[PDB]
Amino acid sequence: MKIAKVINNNVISVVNEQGKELVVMGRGLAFQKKSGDDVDEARIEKVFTLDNKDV
Amino acid sequence: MKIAKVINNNVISVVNEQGKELVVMGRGLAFQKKSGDDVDEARIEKVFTLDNKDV
RNA sequence: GGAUUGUUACUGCUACGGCAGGCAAAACC
């Protein structure tokens, strides 16, 4: 995977291999980071998955 | 609904009746906003849901 | 950038309670 958009120093977005938008929050797993690098799985505390807002 | 947390003016976290954490992405929906208030459903562009980083 | 919000790195400070810097963001200027 890869960072799609850094939301904060402990939260970043990332497109899954399938093509879904996912968010990865963790202890400083997004500090001074950028898009294109793989999300550090060792610092992943919570992963969110894009859902349908219609529901 | 309610704003549990905020990462940036466009994305924020929120807890539903299931007791799970969900992230709500939108355009400038978190600007000048805070936690505790109901999440603006009209500003919800993409919703997210906490998952297990183990998978 | 400016500003406005967010924050858990790490840092500087201390009253050593935390607090601010930094860092980030798709408002707006």
Distance CA B37, CA A9 (A): 24
Whether A50 CB is under 7 Å from strand C: no
Contact B49 A48 (CB under 8 A): yes
Nucleotides of C under 7 A from a protein CB: 4-10, 22-28
Domain spans of chain A?
Answer: 1-55
Residues B1-55, CATH architecture = Roll (2.30)
Distance CA A21, CA B42 (A): 20
Distance CA A51, CA B39 (A): 16
Spatial CB neighbours of A11, under 8 Å, sequence gap ≥ 6: A23, A24, A25, A26, A30, B7
Technique of determination: NMR
Contact assessment for residue B4 and residue B13, using Cβ atoms and an 8 Å cutoff: yes
Distance CA B2, CA A34 (A): 30
Beta strand residue intervals within chain B, DSSP E: 3-8, 11-15, 21-25, 46-51
Angle of CA points B5, A53, B46, to nearest 5°: 60
Distance CA A26, CA A17 (A): 20
